[model samples]
Target chain A: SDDLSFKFKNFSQNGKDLSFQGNASVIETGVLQLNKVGNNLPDETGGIARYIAPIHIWNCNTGELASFITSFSFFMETSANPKAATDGLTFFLAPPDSPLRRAGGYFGLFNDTKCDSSYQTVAVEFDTIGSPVNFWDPGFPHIGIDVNCVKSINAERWNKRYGLNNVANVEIIYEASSKTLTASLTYPSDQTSISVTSIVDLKEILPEWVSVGFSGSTYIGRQATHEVLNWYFTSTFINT
Target chain B: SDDLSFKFKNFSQNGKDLSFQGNASVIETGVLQLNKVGNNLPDETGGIARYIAPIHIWNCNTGELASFITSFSFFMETSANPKAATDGLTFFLAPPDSPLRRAGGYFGLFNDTKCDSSYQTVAVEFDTIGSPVNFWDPGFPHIGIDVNCVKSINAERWNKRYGLNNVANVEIIYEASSKTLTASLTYPSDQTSISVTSIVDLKEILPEWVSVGFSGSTYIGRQATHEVLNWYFTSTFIN
Candidate 1:
């Protein structure tokens, strides 16, 4: 029998809970695989259809899994008419054991839209087009961070709009203890800081006992390539 | 008959005074044809040579002749190298009654090159090639002023460096009463103030009074187009 396994069941009105369970050595060593299941669609004509999901880590040593040391690479695929595609997606690290929410408005698994402000989520959004504030888009993909809720302030205050010819690579590092997160984008002659937001207090948000993992989504209208490569969770108190 | 008349002559040494009798009014007021004669190599190469002879003015109402200035134009032509000819020439103003000196170095007919400490003479030289430092042929065609035997510092500096580009125009103005002499060159975008020296103490140099006229030269080797459109002199005792 296969050692690595996961199960997905529709739970809320329009969302699902994806649970992972196995005794594979890979899990003990802090590694898990994420497989894609379905596509997302737009809600209205010009509106972007988005997907939000929550990742949950459980049944692991507190010391070994509490640190949540993880990094991953992802990409998006778009349609022929580029405008029909979304700017990009966002990545969020929520409280270790928060319950999954609906899939449409702000209270969903992760607020893909600025409709609600209930969840404690920090997101790194890959926006495609410029917002209404006359932000100059360099005709390239851009990256930003939003904390707590999908507040308009996060979208308005981002500096250093990058162009299509500018991007070489990007990296995000999160120090769980310090509760600080930083994202960097590198170009040929320069490296710029895209987003650095410490929105949530990890100690106050996470329960003394809980699981933590990764969540991601893609919207309709504009399609982007998305994937997660590697992840690891650890608690300093655990020897294994 | 030609209404304007002039004479030309040559000298082999310095301090040799070449004199002729005739008021410039002959040419000054168009009353008599003015005669002019000159000898010297103005260009680095040989071609149709053009020169302006120096004149000395002893008596005349400087203001009256000021309105009747004389003019001439010159061009350097070559049969050997017609396409690349360079222009060369000079203009001068001397006292009407004085003798002309021999021609050779920087100062010639106006006076001896060694008489700079006394006599006052001004020469605007346009040479095609650079001339020897101590000799008149500093070897290049440029625009400059030589006062008596002392050359204008600015003219000497720019000329020695071959600074003047294409020969365009030169103008000489002499204010008699103040005894101030001014020479200027208009070359394309570059204008040169060749020399602006005063000769107020003229009674000390020439005992026989003075004559006012123009003189120029063209050397052998390379030739260019040269011309003198106009030249004039006047004097006043009302200082």
Candidate 2:
């Protein structure tokens, strides 16, 4: 009952249950192919949302005070003039079994009629284009952290992480003892890195038995391949 | 089924059943972190006890088995709030490789009344706590090899230290040709290295696809942090 860690080997994908949603497939070539080369798969039930193991990270009551670290690497398809892949990607932790829609900049992380800053989760958005539904968007080609809201808690989240290329690694860590969240990205292509930090008490936001997963979406004209090369997670539970 | 294979190189969760069972989680971060931090979770039970499937080793049915090599690095600490440290860690090959319920002194490796003798698993244990049952202990904090579980087949024993005690490098090899298990550890604290060997016959006790996993246990006593940062295994097939 100490440290909790989940390791995803290189280029491994999943079956129907690897995750509940998403058109993700893991081929033998170490490719976590998210979307098809081109086409209509599900009727909007896009989710990398489901998983083999659910992230029982925190409980509203006793399971609070938790510490965790997640790191991952991936390559987003840089196709199409305005960008082949639409709403980019998101590394998120939310209520287990919650309905995640695959439309708009919600990136399958938040699903509501409108892009209000009311998402009840924490996420790191690798957004490609700005969403007309939300105003907190720093526009396309940027990365930022979202707390309960995809709009971002700080104005600085907009363009700090210029853009990710074919190769990139990201580290997201949360320390419950100190209630701190840190996000850092290393662009192996340019040997450059961008880091952002935030103070958050996950217990204040998450339910009892939180689930963490990756969600990516692309509707209508925008669609590109999303490949996750690798990812890692470790947590220390506090039954407070 | 006791046959099991070991592999490394990813950090994402696989629900297809990597091993049999354990209080474990897998994410795709570069490392297969084996434990969650905290206090008295299981009834003295902990660590990982799962393995790669396809259930092929020496016997495809002899419920055969195979010999292989494993090398990895890890960091063990008490994490945050530590009123106590843990018993330590172990990497082993067990029959019908799956979830283990052993607790405390067993380090999820074995369950017995006393160290007088028990367990048919082969393991190189990086032990920290003392077993009230094993009267032959060289003392707390030591490394050794176990044939079944507690009874070290003349296990090469030594003092235990954590937090990359020395070099944080370790190598474990199982020779299918020889049915032998060998372990080596380097200490950065004293610039010293320790090594040990044990006899292990895969087809002898193991059922078939023996699970290769990491398991541990924590008590009200010294609850230290235990984790394996990296682990990679390569196996040689037998006809």
Candidate 3:
């Protein structure tokens, strides 16, 4: 058995060690689905389902950090009515004990109980729609990195709705050597949209063991179907 | 109680068989619908709400490749107002997607239909409306084939100029050997004709279980009501 650390890889290979709360599930085929399409109605709003790797991760000894590299693919129905697939999902590193948040804008990493500048979580979000008041309106079908607020610290916008086949790919990497983090996205087409990187010391922001997981959220009045076709996670440094 | 398989060779010789979505329907026995006569077009000009058909092709054992041929007859009525019949439809082949680009200039063939972008959809569009950008018009209300978007690879000036009621006949054949497709249009009554051909690798771009169907779209300000009188589509045709 692997250590009870915030680490998950090859999904199926680590099934018993994963935790699914709310609407998330470790499906029959091993795909970790965050939000469901038929679960809600067109006139109603819902979702912020969470899927967490069974244990929290970080350097328990020096409190440095366990480096990680992960790749995953998802479908937000790029070609569906823009209104249907409301908000997207997020891959994050949150402080332990952080509660699952509400859906719509938060992307499932924080709740009213823990949201702010001191929120202490770093999330890479694939948000399909913008807000009602239109503050961080990258609109829909864009990518962003959220430090604490869903408002994003850095972001990239994609072309008009995804093309014919809207499947997409993403990679998230955290290098302990240089203490840097990077995220990249690729659409079905060879066209690459955004590649973002940030250099921040994990020891300063994250605690000895932080929750590393995935969250998906959606809203009303559109198709809020979220699917994860493939997921993989690998960690080098483990809790000593 | 026969096969409702939209399979066609001498279409109309059989009864009408089809499935309708969005704003289209069959008015009478021989009348296969295009746009509903009085149906107000959706206020949108993008995505796939245009309409659709079920799995009609890409049914290979390997679920891999295919070669096909199809033909059809149609009628365009500039009824109510020439502007009311605002756009046209496309005989299309596509795997699937969310609602595709809408009607601004796509004829429901694509939504703003980007260029240099790799999207999978091939279509021959008979469009009634063009664009103000002047980039897409070989001339409005013409015939064109769109590889992946509304941008036409082959097109010509055409219209209700043929005669009364805008009745026309079309034959589209795809040759598997050369990876080529040819479309010939004729106003049967007058022989007023137009034919265009292009090389396309159907198996190269399309996925298995591709939907062989037609789509129609309408934007606001100028709306188009459409009707397709008769049609035909067949499988196992190599040439």
Candidate 4:
């Protein structure tokens, strides 16, 4: 299915876990890509019971390796009262390495055992939590890139805070042709119609050949459960 | 004199131009200490001048030897296009080094000098021109501070054009008590209160001792002549 939309308690064994569904025809043994446009899930007092998840694509005919790209739009509510709201969130492009579980503590299934900075995956987090090192103060959440590890970038106070209720559109475009990938986040109001903000070229980090998918999680006390609204994607065959 | 106001092109005697007379006091001493509010000149142009000519001040008493503070509010016409406008103007506190002259060419007085980067003056220029090496691109004007040398700090493009027929207020606050100098540019609309679009602190580079006055110039292709509707100043002393 090309456009598959669904909500899940997490990931499940049966195929019925997906909420919305769409499909694209397969031309050859090339690449598969998907994209989604949506806002974050609302904050819950008891914490999020359901995480708005991505649509899964199962290549029934070929049974070959399947890869996809995903993206979304999100905004946080601003508040003068510190205790009432927060401005932090986490994003994941996880492999189907583990079973999807509960939405509480450490985000169920996608926990990294090693938690080392040399892992094979990449994550972009808008962390509002204060770091022991003065550089990572949460009062100013900056755009960061984490490869394998949970937090690698330094958090400096000079970084200005992107206040709440500010909508930022995010895109993660993956080109399986040369095994290259890229991710971007943009604030439409802050930028001119033609300007691009926060672009990351992933060819240096991602492996030359591999499988790709999406994963995400939020913890209690840290932040509320995350949600995603609209979604979509496109892909082309590798000539080489 | 305190709270003084003057006009341009007064009568000349013995090839010497006389100061325009009004309700304000005149300073015969080589130094002028600006220590009151509403002390300013009238709008010379219908609003067509690009650079406002620099006014002279001397015999500043207060042996402390410090910087002076001043402010003004201006409005430009809608037909005034920033792209077609000449380079913006500025206020300078120079050490009686040179006299003022015509604008447009290199030495058009004020802050348009191509050389003299080492001149001992603190100038806050509201610049409209953009240079690559200077790290300013063409779009909107910016507020900058040039010490003995021209360097851009807090360099960022402005959201609106400088020539837009809008009410803009600029305040140059000099802390003679502590000898700290800073400038703030504000823009206000009918819908919203005044907001500071740009601010620059001058004490970060230059020392605490320097002359304080006004200096500005306009380029042929970069900007046009604009008028100052009202200029005012206030000081800690009674004057």
* Top lDDT hit: 2
Question: Which of the two candidates, 1 or 4, achieves a greater lDDT against the reference?
Answer: 4
lDDT of every predicted structure (CA atoms): 0.36, 0.59, 0.58, 0.37
Poorly placed runs, candidate 4 (over 4 Å): A1-240, B1-67, B77-80, B101-118, B132-140, B153-157, B160-164, B190-216, B221-223, B236-239
lDDT per residue as tens, model 4, A71-112:
556544332333322334445443323234332222222244
What TM-score would each prediction reach against the true structure?
0.30, 0.51, 0.43, 0.31
How would you encode candidate 1's per-residue C-alpha lDDT over B1-239 as one tens digit per residue?
00112221111111112222321112222211222222343322221111222222322222221111223323334433532233334554444433444332332343434546455454555544443533543444455655565343334333422222444445555565565555555444455435334444333433223334443333343323233333322222222
Docking class of 3: incorrect
The first chain of model 3 has a TM-score of 0.77
lDDT of 2 by residue, B1-239 (tens): 12122334333343333553455566455445455556546546465745433233454423434667777776666653422366667787765534465766776666663542235477778766544534555555567877665756655555555555533668898777777778988765566778887666767656444556676556544555566665666564542
For candidate 4, give the lDDT of residue A37.
17
Question: Residues B35-98, candidate 3, lDDT per residue (tens digit)?
Answer: 5434334564322321122332333333434466667777655444673345677788765453
Candidate 2 stretches greater than 4 Å from native: A13-20, A42-45, A49-51, A54-64, A82-85, A113-120, A133-136, A155-165, A237-240, B1-239
Q: Over 4 Å off in model 1, which ranges?
A: A1-68, A95-118, A133-142, A152-170, A176-178, A185-195, A209-211, A232-240, B1-239
Q: What tens-digit string does per-residue lDDT give for candidate 3 at A1-240?
A: 012212222234223334565566656655666765564433322343233322224444335466777787776553357654567778877764676656666666655333476778888877776655335656556677777676776777754343327777888988877777899887757675678777877766665545556777666555555667665555555322
* TM-score (chain A only) of candidate 1: 0.49
- Please compute DockQ, using alpha carbons, for every candidate against the native two-chain complex: 0.00, 0.04, 0.01, 0.00
